[PDB]
Design a protein around this ligand. Structure first.
Ligand SMILES: Nc1ncnc2c1ncn2[C@@H]1O[C@H](COP(=O)(O)OP(=O)(O)O)[C@@H](O)[C@H]1O
Length: 244
């Protein structure tokens, strides 16, 4: 089963804004008849805040294919980037409406070395060509995730490309409660568990780390042959995730 919005907690504003992307992908013709359409949307936030989960959730809510691409695939220098970019969008266009998710978009079009210049330029221009090539109601939504929006190439954020953004920040104490409670639905919660106390002791943690706390507490409780996941198991898992 694909992701849904009910899997995303601690950033209600982001999913509310992205619901518009779901409504477009469900019916691009009906969406356009009211009169501006989105092509590229930037997801901005630290690692583990659920940018990939949101992108997958938008495809799941809309019922459209999801295509993944990582900007990190060009970290070493290795292969032809433009061929990778061209083939990905061809598969997405053939399955439109669809979602293309570009993780670590800051990597594409980076400065890098003068030796890297010919490699970086061809990959960047290929992405720019595919985005500019979407006609009318092409059906393809491009979601780009980055932790460093100031590091993006200026060509990427020009009008008609990645000209809309959605912040996916670290959850506050209320969001951490919602995240902890959501993943705690899958565990047998003990009688002394205080999720609010745990959320108050996890300021700065991402949703991924919070999910890790719930899962590590359940495993630790199972190893001790306990009948339920107790507060001591959450405290142990919290310290393990925080110390890294
Ligand atoms: N906001 C969130 N709400 C619920 N779970 C989350 C959230 N953010 C992250 N997670 C959990 O952490 C996992 C990894 O998150 P991910 O989408 O890869 O984050 P990102 O792409 O921002 O680094 C998700 O599959 C999910 O289980």
């Amino acid at each position: 089963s694909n992701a849904r919005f009910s899997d995303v907690h601690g950033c209600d504003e982001a999913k509310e804004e992205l619901q518009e992307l779901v409504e477009f992908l469900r019916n691009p013709e009906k969406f356009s008849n009211l009169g501006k359409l989105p092509k590229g949307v930037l997801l901005v936030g630290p690692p583990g805040t659920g940018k990939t989960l949101l992108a997958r959730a938008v495809a799941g809510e809309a019922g459209v294919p999801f295509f993944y691409m990582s900007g990190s695939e060009f970290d070493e220098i290795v292969g032809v980037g433009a061929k990778r970019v061209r083939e990905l969008f061809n598969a997405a266009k053939a399955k439109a409406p669809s979602i293309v998710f570009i993780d670590e978009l800051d990597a594409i079009g980076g400065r890098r070395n003068s030796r890297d210049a010919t490699y970086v330029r061809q990959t960047l221009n290929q992405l720019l060509t595919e985005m500019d090539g979407f006609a009318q109601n092409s059906g393809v939504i491009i979601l780009g995730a980055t932790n460093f929006p100031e590091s993006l190439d200026k060509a990427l954020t020009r009008p008609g490309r990645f000209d809309r953004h959605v912040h996916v920040s670290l959850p506050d104490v209320r969001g951490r409660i919602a995240i902890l409670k959501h993943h705690a639905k899958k565990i047998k919660i003990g009688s002394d568990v205080n999720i609010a106390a745990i959320a108050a002791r996890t300021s700065g943690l991402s949703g991924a780390e919070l999910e890790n706390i719930v899962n590590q507490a359940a495993v630790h409780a199972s190893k001790e042959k306990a009948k339920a996941v107790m507060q001591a198991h959450f405290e142990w898992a919290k310290d393990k995730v925080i110390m890294g």
